[PDB]
Coordinates of C-alpha atoms (C1' of nucleotides) in Angstrom, one line a residue:
Chain I
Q178 CA 0.2 -0.1 0.3
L179 CA 1.3 3.3 -0.9
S180 CA 0.6 5.2 2.7
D181 CA 1.1 1.5 4.2
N182 CA 4.4 0.5 2.5
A183 CA 5.0 4.2 2.5
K184 CA 5.7 4.5 6.4
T185 CA 6.5 1.1 7.3
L186 CA 9.0 1.4 4.4
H187 CA 10.2 4.3 6.3
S188 CA 10.9 3.2 9.8
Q189 CA 13.4 0.4 8.3
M190 CA 14.9 3.1 6.9
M191 CA 14.1 5.8 10.1
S192 CA 14.9 2.4 12.8
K193 CA 18.1 1.5 10.9
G194 CA 18.0 2.3 6.8
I195 CA 20.5 -0.8 6.1
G196 CA 22.7 2.6 6.8
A197 CA 24.4 4.4 3.7
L198 CA 25.3 0.5 2.5
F199 CA 22.2 0.1 1.6
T200 CA 21.5 -1.4 -1.7
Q201 CA 17.9 -1.9 -3.4
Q202 CA 19.2 -5.9 -2.2
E203 CA 18.8 -5.0 1.2
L204 CA 15.4 -4.4 0.6
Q205 CA 14.9 -8.3 -0.3
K206 CA 17.0 -9.2 2.5
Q207 CA 14.4 -7.7 5.3
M208 CA 11.1 -7.6 2.8
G209 CA 11.1 -8.7 -0.3
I210 CA 7.4 -10.0 -0.2
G211 CA 6.2 -7.3 -2.0
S212 CA 6.1 -8.0 -5.7
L213 CA 9.2 -6.6 -7.7
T214 CA 7.0 -3.8 -10.0
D215 CA 5.2 -3.1 -6.7
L216 CA 8.0 -2.5 -4.4
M217 CA 9.8 -1.1 -6.9
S218 CA 6.3 1.3 -7.9
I219 CA 6.0 2.2 -4.6
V220 CA 9.9 3.1 -4.4
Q221 CA 9.5 5.0 -7.5
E222 CA 6.5 6.6 -6.0
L223 CA 8.4 7.3 -3.1
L224 CA 11.3 8.8 -3.8
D225 CA 8.7 10.9 -6.5
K226 CA 7.1 11.2 -3.0
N227 CA 10.3 12.1 -1.6
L228 CA 9.7 10.1 1.3
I229 CA 12.8 8.3 0.1
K230 CA 16.1 8.5 -1.6
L231 CA 18.7 7.0 -4.4
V232 CA 22.8 7.2 -3.9
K233 CA 25.0 6.5 -6.3
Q234 CA 27.5 4.1 -5.6
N235 CA 29.0 0.3 -6.3
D236 CA 26.6 -2.0 -7.1
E237 CA 23.1 -1.7 -8.0
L238 CA 21.5 1.2 -6.6
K239 CA 21.5 2.6 -2.9
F240 CA 18.5 4.0 -1.3
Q241 CA 17.8 6.2 2.6
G242 CA 14.8 7.7 4.6
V243 CA 14.2 11.0 3.9
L244 CA 12.4 13.9 6.1
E245 CA 10.5 16.4 4.6
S246 CA 13.2 18.7 5.9
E247 CA 15.3 18.5 2.6
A248 CA 12.4 16.6 1.1
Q249 CA 10.4 19.5 0.9
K250 CA 14.1 21.6 0.2
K251 CA 14.5 19.6 -3.0
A252 CA 10.8 19.2 -4.0
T253 CA 11.0 23.2 -3.3
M254 CA 13.8 23.1 -5.8
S255 CA 13.5 24.0 -9.6
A256 CA 13.9 20.9 -12.1
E257 CA 17.3 22.6 -13.0
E258 CA 18.6 21.9 -8.9
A259 CA 16.6 19.4 -9.3
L260 CA 19.3 16.4 -9.8
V261 CA 21.8 19.2 -9.3
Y262 CA 20.9 19.8 -5.7
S263 CA 21.0 16.1 -4.8
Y264 CA 24.4 15.3 -7.1
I265 CA 26.3 18.3 -5.4
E266 CA 25.5 17.1 -1.7
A267 CA 27.3 13.3 -2.9
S268 CA 30.8 14.7 -1.9
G269 CA 28.9 15.8 1.3
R270 CA 33.2 16.6 2.9
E271 CA 34.8 17.2 -0.3
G272 CA 32.4 18.9 -1.8
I273 CA 32.2 19.5 -6.0
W274 CA 33.2 22.1 -8.6
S275 CA 32.4 23.7 -11.4
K276 CA 33.2 22.3 -14.9
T277 CA 33.3 18.8 -13.3
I278 CA 28.7 19.8 -12.8
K279 CA 29.2 20.9 -16.4
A280 CA 30.0 17.2 -17.9
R281 CA 28.0 15.2 -15.3
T282 CA 24.7 18.1 -15.6
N283 CA 24.9 18.1 -19.2
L284 CA 24.6 21.7 -19.1
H285 CA 26.4 24.7 -20.1
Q286 CA 28.1 27.5 -17.4
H287 CA 25.0 29.6 -18.6
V288 CA 22.3 27.9 -16.3
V289 CA 24.3 26.1 -14.1
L290 CA 25.3 29.9 -12.1
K291 CA 21.7 31.4 -11.6
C292 CA 20.9 27.9 -10.2
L293 CA 23.7 28.0 -7.8
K294 CA 23.2 31.9 -7.4
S295 CA 19.2 30.7 -6.3
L296 CA 20.9 27.7 -3.7
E297 CA 23.5 30.9 -2.4
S298 CA 20.0 32.6 -1.4
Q299 CA 19.0 29.6 -0.1
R300 CA 22.3 28.5 1.6
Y301 CA 22.0 24.8 1.2
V302 CA 25.9 25.4 -0.9
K303 CA 28.6 27.3 0.4
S304 CA 31.4 29.0 -1.7
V305 CA 34.6 27.0 -0.7
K306 CA 38.0 28.1 -1.4
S307 CA 40.1 25.2 -0.5
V308 CA 44.2 24.0 -0.5
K309 CA 44.4 23.4 -4.3
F310 CA 45.0 27.1 -6.6
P311 CA 41.6 29.3 -6.1
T312 CA 40.3 29.6 -9.4
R313 CA 38.1 26.5 -8.0
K314 CA 35.2 27.5 -5.7
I315 CA 34.1 24.5 -4.8
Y316 CA 31.2 24.4 -3.4
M317 CA 29.5 21.6 -0.6
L318 CA 26.6 21.7 1.2
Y319 CA 26.1 25.0 3.8
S320 CA 25.8 22.7 6.7
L321 CA 29.4 20.9 6.7
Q322 CA 33.0 21.2 5.9
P323 CA 35.0 18.4 6.8
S324 CA 38.2 18.8 4.2
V325 CA 41.7 18.9 4.1
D326 CA 42.9 22.5 5.2
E327 CA 49.1 24.6 9.9
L328 CA 47.2 26.8 7.5
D329 CA 48.3 28.2 4.3
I330 CA 49.3 31.4 4.5
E331 CA 51.8 33.5 7.0
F332 CA 51.9 33.8 10.7
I333 CA 54.2 30.4 9.6
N334 CA 57.8 32.3 11.1
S335 CA 56.1 33.7 14.2
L336 CA 55.9 31.2 16.0
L337 CA 59.4 29.2 14.8
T338 CA 61.7 32.6 15.8
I339 CA 59.7 31.5 19.7
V340 CA 60.1 27.8 19.6
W341 CA 63.9 28.3 18.2
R342 CA 64.1 30.2 21.4
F343 CA 63.4 27.3 23.5
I344 CA 65.4 25.0 21.9
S345 CA 68.3 26.9 22.3
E346 CA 68.0 26.7 26.3
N347 CA 67.7 23.1 25.4
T348 CA 71.1 22.6 24.1
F349 CA 73.4 24.1 26.2
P350 CA 72.5 26.9 29.3
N351 CA 71.3 30.2 28.0
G352 CA 72.3 32.2 25.5
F353 CA 74.8 33.2 27.7
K354 CA 76.5 36.3 25.4
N355 CA 78.7 39.0 26.7
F356 CA 82.5 38.8 26.6
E357 CA 84.7 36.6 24.9
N358 CA 83.7 33.1 25.9
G359 CA 80.4 32.7 27.3
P360 CA 79.0 29.7 26.8
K361 CA 78.3 26.1 28.3
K362 CA 81.6 26.5 30.4
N363 CA 82.3 23.7 28.6
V364 CA 78.4 22.4 28.8
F365 CA 78.7 22.2 32.7
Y366 CA 80.6 18.3 32.7
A367 CA 81.0 16.4 29.9
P368 CA 79.1 17.7 27.6
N369 CA 78.8 13.4 26.4
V370 CA 77.0 13.4 30.3
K371 CA 74.2 15.5 28.3
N372 CA 72.0 13.3 26.3
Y373 CA 69.1 15.4 25.3
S374 CA 66.5 16.0 23.1
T375 CA 64.0 18.4 22.8
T376 CA 60.9 16.5 20.4
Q377 CA 57.5 15.5 22.3
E378 CA 58.7 18.5 25.2
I379 CA 57.7 21.0 22.2
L380 CA 53.7 20.1 23.0
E381 CA 53.9 20.5 26.4
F382 CA 55.7 24.7 25.6
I383 CA 54.0 24.7 23.4
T384 CA 50.7 25.1 25.8
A385 CA 51.5 28.3 26.5
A386 CA 49.9 29.9 23.9
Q387 CA 49.8 33.8 24.3
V388 CA 48.9 33.1 20.8
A389 CA 45.7 32.9 18.4
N390 CA 44.9 29.3 17.0
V391 CA 44.4 26.4 17.3
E392 CA 46.9 23.0 19.7
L393 CA 49.3 20.7 17.2
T394 CA 49.6 17.8 16.1
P395 CA 53.6 16.3 17.1
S396 CA 53.9 15.4 13.4
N397 CA 53.0 19.0 11.9
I398 CA 56.0 19.6 14.5
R399 CA 58.2 17.3 13.2
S400 CA 57.9 19.0 9.9
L401 CA 58.4 23.0 11.7
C402 CA 61.7 21.5 13.0
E403 CA 62.0 20.5 9.4
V404 CA 62.3 23.4 8.5
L405 CA 64.7 24.8 10.8
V406 CA 66.9 22.0 10.0
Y407 CA 66.9 23.3 6.7
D408 CA 68.0 26.5 7.2
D409 CA 70.5 25.5 9.8
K410 CA 68.9 26.8 13.1
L411 CA 69.3 23.7 14.9
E412 CA 69.8 20.0 14.2
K413 CA 68.7 16.7 13.6
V414 CA 70.0 13.8 16.0
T415 CA 69.0 10.9 16.5
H416 CA 65.3 10.4 15.5
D417 CA 63.6 13.1 17.1
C418 CA 66.3 14.0 19.1
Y419 CA 67.6 17.9 17.8
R420 CA 70.2 20.0 18.6
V421 CA 71.1 23.7 17.5
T422 CA 73.7 25.0 15.0
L423 CA 75.1 27.5 17.4
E424 CA 74.2 30.3 14.7
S425 CA 72.6 31.8 17.4
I426 CA 76.1 33.5 16.8
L427 CA 74.3 34.5 13.6
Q428 CA 71.9 36.4 15.4
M429 CA 75.0 38.4 17.1
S430 CA 90.4 34.9 5.8
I431 CA 86.9 34.7 6.7
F432 CA 83.4 32.6 5.9
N433 CA 80.2 34.3 7.3
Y434 CA 78.5 36.4 5.1
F435 CA 76.9 38.3 8.1
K436 CA 79.4 40.5 9.9
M437 CA 80.2 41.8 6.4
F438 CA 79.8 44.7 4.5
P439 CA 79.6 45.7 0.7
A440 CA 81.6 48.6 -0.6
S441 CA 79.4 49.2 -3.6
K442 CA 80.5 52.6 -5.3
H443 CA 83.1 53.6 -7.7
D444 CA 85.7 51.2 -7.9
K445 CA 84.2 48.4 -10.7
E446 CA 86.4 45.6 -9.2
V447 CA 83.8 43.9 -7.5
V448 CA 83.3 39.8 -7.4
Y449 CA 79.4 39.7 -7.6
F450 CA 78.2 36.2 -8.2
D451 CA 76.6 37.4 -11.8
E452 CA 78.8 38.9 -15.3
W453 CA 79.3 35.1 -16.4
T454 CA 76.4 32.9 -16.0
Chain E
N1201 CA 23.8 51.9 -26.6
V1202 CA 27.4 52.9 -27.5
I1203 CA 28.8 50.7 -30.4
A1204 CA 25.1 52.3 -31.3
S1205 CA 26.4 56.0 -31.6
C1206 CA 29.1 55.6 -32.2
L1207 CA 28.2 54.3 -35.4
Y1208 CA 25.8 56.1 -36.0
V1209 CA 27.3 60.0 -36.3
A1210 CA 29.6 59.0 -38.9
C1211 CA 26.8 58.0 -41.5
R1212 CA 25.0 61.2 -40.2
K1213 CA 28.6 63.2 -40.6
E1214 CA 28.8 61.8 -44.3
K1215 CA 25.0 62.6 -44.9
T1216 CA 23.1 59.5 -45.1
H1217 CA 20.2 57.9 -45.3
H1218 CA 19.7 56.0 -41.5
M1219 CA 18.5 56.9 -38.7
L1220 CA 18.1 56.4 -35.1
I1221 CA 14.4 55.1 -34.6
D1222 CA 14.9 52.2 -37.3
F1223 CA 18.6 51.7 -36.1
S1224 CA 17.0 50.7 -32.6
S1225 CA 15.1 47.8 -33.8
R1226 CA 17.9 45.7 -34.2
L1227 CA 17.1 45.4 -30.6
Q1228 CA 13.9 45.5 -28.2
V1229 CA 15.1 48.4 -26.8
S1230 CA 12.8 51.6 -27.0
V1231 CA 15.0 54.4 -29.2
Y1232 CA 15.0 57.0 -25.6
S1233 CA 17.9 54.7 -24.2
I1234 CA 19.8 54.7 -27.6
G1235 CA 18.8 57.9 -27.7
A1236 CA 19.6 59.2 -24.1
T1237 CA 23.2 57.4 -24.3
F1238 CA 23.8 59.0 -27.6
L1239 CA 22.9 63.0 -26.4
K1240 CA 25.2 61.7 -23.6
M1241 CA 28.3 60.5 -25.3
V1242 CA 27.2 64.0 -27.3
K1243 CA 28.3 66.3 -24.3
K1244 CA 31.6 64.2 -23.4
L1245 CA 32.8 64.5 -26.5
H1246 CA 33.0 67.6 -28.7
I1247 CA 30.7 67.4 -32.4
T1248 CA 30.4 70.1 -35.1
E1249 CA 27.1 70.6 -36.4
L1250 CA 27.1 69.2 -39.7
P1251 CA 25.4 66.4 -39.1
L1252 CA 21.6 67.5 -39.9
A1253 CA 19.1 65.3 -41.6
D1254 CA 16.3 66.1 -43.8
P1255 CA 13.6 64.2 -45.7
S1256 CA 15.2 65.3 -49.2
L1257 CA 17.4 62.4 -48.2
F1258 CA 15.2 60.2 -46.9
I1259 CA 12.3 60.5 -49.6
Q1260 CA 15.3 58.7 -51.9
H1261 CA 15.4 55.3 -49.9
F1262 CA 11.8 55.0 -48.6
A1263 CA 11.0 55.2 -52.0
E1264 CA 13.0 52.3 -53.0
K1265 CA 10.7 49.3 -50.6
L1266 CA 7.1 51.6 -52.3
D1267 CA 7.4 48.7 -55.4
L1268 CA 4.8 50.3 -57.9
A1269 CA 7.2 50.8 -61.4
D1270 CA 9.7 54.2 -62.7
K1271 CA 6.6 56.5 -62.3
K1272 CA 7.7 57.0 -58.5
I1273 CA 11.0 59.3 -60.1
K1274 CA 9.0 61.3 -61.6
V1275 CA 7.0 61.3 -57.9
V1276 CA 10.3 61.5 -56.3
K1277 CA 10.6 65.2 -58.0
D1278 CA 7.3 65.3 -57.6
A1279 CA 7.6 64.7 -53.4
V1280 CA 10.7 66.6 -53.8
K1281 CA 10.0 70.2 -54.6
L1282 CA 7.1 69.8 -52.2
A1283 CA 9.4 68.9 -49.4
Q1284 CA 11.2 72.0 -50.0
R1285 CA 8.4 74.3 -50.4
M1286 CA 7.1 72.2 -47.0
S1287 CA 11.0 73.3 -45.4
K1288 CA 9.9 76.9 -46.7
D1289 CA 6.6 77.2 -45.7
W1290 CA 7.6 77.2 -41.7
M1291 CA 5.7 73.7 -40.9
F1292 CA 9.1 71.6 -41.0
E1293 CA 10.9 72.3 -38.2
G1294 CA 10.9 70.9 -34.5
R1295 CA 9.0 67.7 -35.6
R1296 CA 10.8 63.9 -36.2
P1297 CA 12.2 64.1 -39.6
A1298 CA 11.0 60.0 -41.2
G1299 CA 7.2 61.7 -40.7
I1300 CA 7.2 64.4 -42.7
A1301 CA 8.7 62.9 -45.3
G1302 CA 6.6 59.7 -45.7
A1303 CA 3.2 62.7 -45.4
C1304 CA 5.3 63.9 -48.3
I1305 CA 5.4 60.3 -50.4
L1306 CA 1.9 59.8 -50.1
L1307 CA 1.2 63.4 -51.5
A1308 CA 2.9 62.9 -54.2
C1309 CA 2.4 59.8 -54.4
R1310 CA -1.8 60.6 -54.2
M1311 CA -0.8 63.3 -56.5
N1312 CA 0.4 60.9 -59.3
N1313 CA -3.0 58.9 -58.9
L1314 CA -2.4 55.7 -56.9
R1315 CA -3.8 54.1 -53.7
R1316 CA -1.6 53.3 -51.5
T1317 CA -2.8 52.5 -47.7
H1318 CA -1.3 54.3 -44.7
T1319 CA -0.2 51.1 -43.0
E1320 CA 2.2 50.7 -46.5
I1321 CA 3.2 54.5 -45.6
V1322 CA 4.3 54.1 -42.2
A1323 CA 5.8 50.0 -43.1
Chain A
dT308 C1' -20.4 54.0 -38.9
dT309 C1' -17.0 56.8 -39.8
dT310 C1' -14.3 60.0 -39.4
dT311 C1' -12.7 64.6 -36.7
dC312 C1' -12.1 66.0 -32.6
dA313 C1' -10.3 66.3 -28.6
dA314 C1' -8.2 64.7 -24.7
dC315 C1' -5.9 62.0 -21.7
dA316 C1' -2.4 60.8 -20.3
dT317 C1' 2.1 59.8 -20.8
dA318 C1' 7.0 60.0 -22.1
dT319 C1' 10.5 62.6 -23.9
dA320 C1' 15.2 66.1 -21.8
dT321 C1' 17.8 69.7 -18.6
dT322 C1' 19.3 70.5 -13.4
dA323 C1' 20.0 69.8 -10.6
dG324 C1' 21.0 67.8 -5.8
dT325 C1' 21.2 62.5 -3.1
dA326 C1' 22.4 57.1 -2.1
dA327 C1' 21.5 53.2 -3.2
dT328 C1' 21.0 49.4 -5.5
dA329 C1' 21.7 47.0 -9.4
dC330 C1' 24.4 46.6 -13.1
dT331 C1' 27.2 45.8 -17.0
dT332 C1' 31.6 46.7 -18.5
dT333 C1' 36.1 47.2 -18.1
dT334 C1' 40.9 45.4 -15.7
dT335 C1' 43.6 41.9 -14.4
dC336 C1' 45.1 36.7 -13.4
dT337 C1' 45.6 32.0 -13.7
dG338 C1' 44.4 25.8 -15.2
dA339 C1' 58.7 10.3 -55.5
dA340 C1' 64.4 6.1 -54.2
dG341 C1' 68.9 5.4 -52.0
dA342 C1' 71.9 6.3 -47.6
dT343 C1' 71.7 5.9 -42.0
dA344 C1' 70.8 3.6 -37.9
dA345 C1' 68.1 0.0 -34.3
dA346 C1' 67.5 -3.3 -32.8
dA347 C1' 66.6 -8.1 -33.3
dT348 C1' 70.3 -12.2 -34.5
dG349 C1' 74.0 -14.6 -33.8
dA350 C1' 78.6 -16.6 -33.4
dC351 C1' 82.8 -15.9 -30.5
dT352 C1' 85.2 -16.5 -26.7
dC353 C1' 86.4 -15.4 -21.6
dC354 C1' 85.1 -17.1 -18.6
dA355 C1' 83.1 -20.8 -14.5
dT356 C1' 83.0 -25.3 -12.5
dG357 C1' 83.6 -30.8 -12.0
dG358 C1' 85.5 -36.2 -13.0
Chain J
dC1307 C1' 92.4 -29.9 -16.5
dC1308 C1' 89.3 -29.6 -19.4
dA1309 C1' 84.1 -29.7 -21.7
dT1310 C1' 79.9 -27.3 -20.1
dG1311 C1' 76.8 -22.6 -19.3
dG1312 C1' 76.7 -18.3 -19.3
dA1313 C1' 77.6 -13.7 -20.8
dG1314 C1' 80.2 -10.0 -23.1
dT1315 C1' 81.0 -8.3 -27.4
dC1316 C1' 80.9 -7.3 -32.3
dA1317 C1' 79.2 -8.4 -37.3
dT1318 C1' 74.1 -7.9 -40.0
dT1319 C1' 69.7 -7.4 -41.1
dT1320 C1' 65.2 -4.6 -41.2
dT1321 C1' 63.0 -2.1 -40.0
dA1322 C1' 62.5 3.3 -39.5
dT1323 C1' 63.3 8.3 -41.9
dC1324 C1' 64.2 12.5 -46.0
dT1325 C1' 65.9 15.2 -49.8
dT1326 C1' 65.4 15.6 -54.2
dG1327 C1' 62.8 15.8 -58.8
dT1328 C1' 64.2 20.2 -67.3
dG1329 C1' 64.3 25.8 -68.3
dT1330 C1' 61.6 31.5 -69.8
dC1331 C1' 57.7 35.7 -69.5
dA1332 C1' 53.3 36.4 -68.6
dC1333 C1' 49.3 37.8 -65.3
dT1334 C1' 47.4 36.9 -60.9
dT1335 C1' 44.7 38.1 -56.1
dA1336 C1' 48.0 31.8 -27.7
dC1337 C1' 40.6 30.6 -23.9
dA1338 C1' 37.5 31.4 -20.9
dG1339 C1' 36.2 32.6 -16.9
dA1340 C1' 36.6 35.0 -12.6
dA1341 C1' 37.2 39.1 -9.6
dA1342 C1' 37.5 43.8 -9.0
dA1343 C1' 37.4 48.8 -10.2
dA1344 C1' 34.3 52.3 -12.8
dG1345 C1' 30.4 53.8 -14.0
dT1346 C1' 25.9 54.1 -14.9
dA1347 C1' 20.1 53.3 -15.1
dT1348 C1' 16.9 53.9 -11.2
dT1349 C1' 15.1 55.4 -8.5
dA1350 C1' 11.8 60.4 -7.2
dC1351 C1' 10.9 64.6 -7.3
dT1352 C1' 8.9 70.6 -10.3
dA1353 C1' 9.2 72.5 -13.9
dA1354 C1' 8.1 74.9 -17.5
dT1355 C1' 7.7 73.2 -22.9
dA1356 C1' 6.1 70.4 -28.0
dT1357 C1' 5.0 66.2 -30.3
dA1358 C1' 4.2 61.1 -30.5
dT1359 C1' 0.8 57.7 -29.0
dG1360 C1' -2.7 54.9 -27.7
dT1361 C1' -7.3 54.9 -27.2
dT1362 C1' -11.2 55.5 -27.1
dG1363 C1' -14.4 57.7 -26.8
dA1364 C1' -17.3 61.0 -27.7
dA1365 C1' -18.6 63.6 -30.6
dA1366 C1' -20.4 64.1 -35.7
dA1367 C1' -22.2 63.0 -40.7

DNA sequence: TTTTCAACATATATTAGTAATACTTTTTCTGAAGATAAAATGACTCCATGG
DNA sequence: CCATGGAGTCATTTTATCTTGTGTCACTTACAGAAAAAGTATTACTAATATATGTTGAAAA
């Protein structure tokens, strides 16, 4: 019966619905008693009557329970948006992008715009500009934003210069630059007997905050340290153990680009790094 | 509206037969919006006096689609000196030229004793 | 009935002031025969172990 | 210590390729869309003017 099998077939959906993995095979798994064209006549109509849905994945085709919120939503949506909208939420996480909807809908970019903007006033989809290049504005559900993205822009070194200052203290005692030799006084006693990393401790030190952010994982910290391995501010030893390169002195014949300055006027005899090339 | 008038003033200066009312119907638009933009680019540029059209030009091309036969050329001279005097008789000024042109054509046509309806003229 | 009037009205253009919105543009801004060769063919030989 | 197996090098074909092809007159005819910026069209006002335009309709023949 349309209303009876409507509400009890909506009852198996609202109870479990065999989750998202539910296909039409699971119909016969629970109620197969109905004749094929009948149970499919009411499946077709309940999808038309927006009491059930269909998801496109893997074998056969999936079904699910749907309430009037998104049902009156999509029935309220246009015939343009009809397949468009429900096809958009299929991503649900990563979103989907402009031209890749054009081929799937087989429309122009002429029309798919206006229905998108319509969904913008509707606010059931939101403009998302993701990690990959900002030519995109991929569109996911206005409600949900699980995504792959620290952030990709500045105020990186903002914390780097701070963590470096601590890691320095971790190596020998604190700065000790006043006269000729203040450092370490032979690193306390027996510099070898001090075997020390910073590593995990960073996270406990990062608890200090004093900045607008969230916390951060052990993993990404490791990269934060990799940068100062590349800048050679500090040193990577024995896995998570790290030292400093003593280039705190860089802070302040020869090799040391700093503490040096060019002449750079008049006389034409100079050493460039170009004009041979 | 821009390419419109920009194309317009040219064939105006050359003193040919083309007309703003005629010029719009390429679009659904109103022969005002185009006229507005036109008269504005007259301000933002500085333009000479020359483009003053008369019916004496338009009666040529209007005569083309009148069908009929060789007699119209006769009618032409019949119409021309008519319109000319009409300009002289002083009731030409301040009016949409294409109309008084068509009026002249209806006259000389009737002067040449033919039957052509008003609709057929205003087309 | 038809025609002339009339008449009603309403744009049409200027000059303003706003103010706000909406709307197009523009301007960045990127996502025919006979040499020459290449390789498969194959023989040669250094060099391997074992009875 | 020596015949064997395996490979390494080295002639040798056969496929894939490119430069040519008699001379002289005398005419001839970078993709597209996205975003930012600039600027503007309504959007009300009088307020005079004077055509157009429509309709209609009223008024007259």
